[PDB]
Amino acid sequence: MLGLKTSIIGRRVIYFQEITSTNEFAKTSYLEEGTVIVADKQTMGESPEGGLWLSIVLSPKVPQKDLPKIVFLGAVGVVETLKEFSIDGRIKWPNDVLVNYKKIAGVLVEGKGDKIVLGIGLNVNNKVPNGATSMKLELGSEVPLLSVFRSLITNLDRLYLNFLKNPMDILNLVRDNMILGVRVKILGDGSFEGIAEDIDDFGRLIIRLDSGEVKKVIYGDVSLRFL
Amino acid sequence: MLGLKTSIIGRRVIYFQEITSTNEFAKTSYLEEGTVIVADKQTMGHGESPEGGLWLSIVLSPKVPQKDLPKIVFLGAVGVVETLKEFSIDGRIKWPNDVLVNYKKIAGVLVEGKGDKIVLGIGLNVNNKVPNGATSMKLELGSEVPLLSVFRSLITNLDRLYLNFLKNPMDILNLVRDNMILGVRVKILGDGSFEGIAEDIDDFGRLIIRLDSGEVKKVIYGDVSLRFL
Incomplete structure (x- = not known):
């Protein structure tokens, strides 16, 4: 029913109404490559309803040193999706995405055996702490989570496929989007x-x-x- | 991101772009009770099974007398009828597993068992092209219907119906009668x-x-x- 048109990321999506954290679940359970874990809320991320909380399981067949580039894949993916919604996001090394210097999203990557867990938390319609912002606050209107999800997963899938072919390419892309x-x-x-x-x-x-x-x-x- | 608020059914939802059938996956996988499997398309539809429709299966392990097991198909049919009503469509049940509108099939229910596991499969025509004689929510309403909205409604109704079924299976039997042709x-x-x-x-x-x-x-x-x- 989600209608995702992606190659690897998003072939399988698992949703939870609530969970400790999408990364926690992804690290402690076997999931096929490309599986996306999403939840309305995270208990031990306290990620509120309205935001986009997800983790993606990846196992790229690339050099052990290229793994650290995955955090950038997530950050750039967020920047690209934001652009589609007319928002200008900038990356604050190594994993945050800012809009007019206010944090709108964060990326958390964790390794577990031969798999990498790419976690992304994006403020969409949820309430946020002072200093931070959300797509809702930036656009002055609630935005459909499914729309943002489809956009983000599709962008991430494209970036991931390109990464598998040429791991070095992401570097210049993240640079052009990093403060x-x-x-x-x-x-x-x-x-x-x-x-x-x-x-x-x-x-x-x-x-x-x-x-x-x-x-x-x-x-x-x-x-x-x-x- | 789906925004479900349920007790058992829909606690976990697994989505696939395409699979043989949601019922087959539900049978071959070990999943917690209430897990819902949904796919954009079924290539061997158990629950020709095109993008645009709502294809799902629910894993159940009811603590009820064996004699009441056969009523699960009715639970699925009533759930579909209740959801259709919410969308202003008057669907009626064709015993024991189909839902018709103006006598055209809009949905079908297929229940299968494997040990203590019961797989409740439901196929509902929403925006997909349909077979001759059948109909869809889009054909009935005049435009495309958001699958997510239909899903949230259906899973929510099924969760409520399942809880009441566990308490008294006869309630579902009476509801299916009330909504049957x-x-x-x-x-x-x-x-x-x-x-x-x-x-x-x-x-x-x-x-x-x-x-x-x-x-x-x-x-x-x-x-x-x-x-x-």
């Missing part, structure tokens, strides 16, 4: 402060500290705050 | 072939028919196929 060349404060890792200049082949953030040292920050235990 | 001539075929007036259904779900000869026979379904003359 770079600005001062940032790293949360986690070494808590560095400096100029976020670029991302490398692995997806690490290349930052120049005020001391002049240039460091590469890895994804995982990190978040950024623009200064 | 009766008092008209029909033809029964199986063990044999005969015509008569379908007058009522008994508590086990048997159809009571008055033959032109004057004889009255009770017939068990599945063990039949009924045609309106």
Whole structure:
């Protein structure tokens, strides 16, 4: 009934009225590649009704080092879908999507054995905390979740197929949609402060500290705050 | 994202772009009670089974007397009728598993069993092209009908009906009677072939028919196929 016209992502979709977290379920249960887990609400994500909470199971046959690029696949997918709804989203390394500097979506990737779980949380019609925003607030009208879901899954499927053929291509795409060349404060890792200049082949953030040292920050235990 | 608010049926929903049939998948998979399987298209439809229709199966494990098991097909039919009413369509039940509008088939129910598992399959014509003689919600209403809206309505009605069924199976039998096409001539075929007036259904779900000869026979379904003359 969902009418998805995708190759891999979305061949199977499993919906729950409520669950601890879509990522949790995806990591602890066997699901065929491309399976999408979606829920009206997440108990231990407290992701409210109205938002789009999902996880996608992937097992790309690409080098072990190219795996970290999956978070970017999710972020770009969100940016593209937002564009279709006339919203301009920008990526804040390594996994957030901002609209006029307010967070509208976040990506969480986790590995479990030979499978990767791509989690995406997008504020659509749900209430959001101060500082954040939603498609509803940005458009001044509620937007049908199914519409956003179909758009996002279709964009992600296309990006994933291209990624499987040429893993390196996503890098330039994420760069053109990422906020770079600005001062940032790293949360986690070494808590560095400096100029976020670029991302490398692995997806690490290349930052120049005020001391002049240039460091590469890895994804995982990190978040950024623009200064 | 589907926005269902149910107790048992619809707690989990599994969607496929295309599969042989939702009933076949429901039979070969181990799923928790209340899980609903839905597909855009069935290539071997159990529940020719085109994009645009609502094709689904529900996994059930009812804690009720064996004698009441046959009523699950009626539960599916009543659920469809209740949903059609919500969409302003007056559907009536053709014993024991079809739903007709102006005597054209708009939906069919197929129940199968495997151990303690009961698979309730339902096929409802919404926006898909239909076979000669059949009809669809789109044909009846004048335009395309959102499948999601129909799904939410149907699953919600079925959940409520299932809860009441667990408490008292007779309630479903009475509801199927109230929404069934009766008092008209029909033809029964199986063990044999005969015509008569379908007058009522008994508590086990048997159809009571008055033959032109004057004889009255009770017939068990599945063990039949009924045609309106």
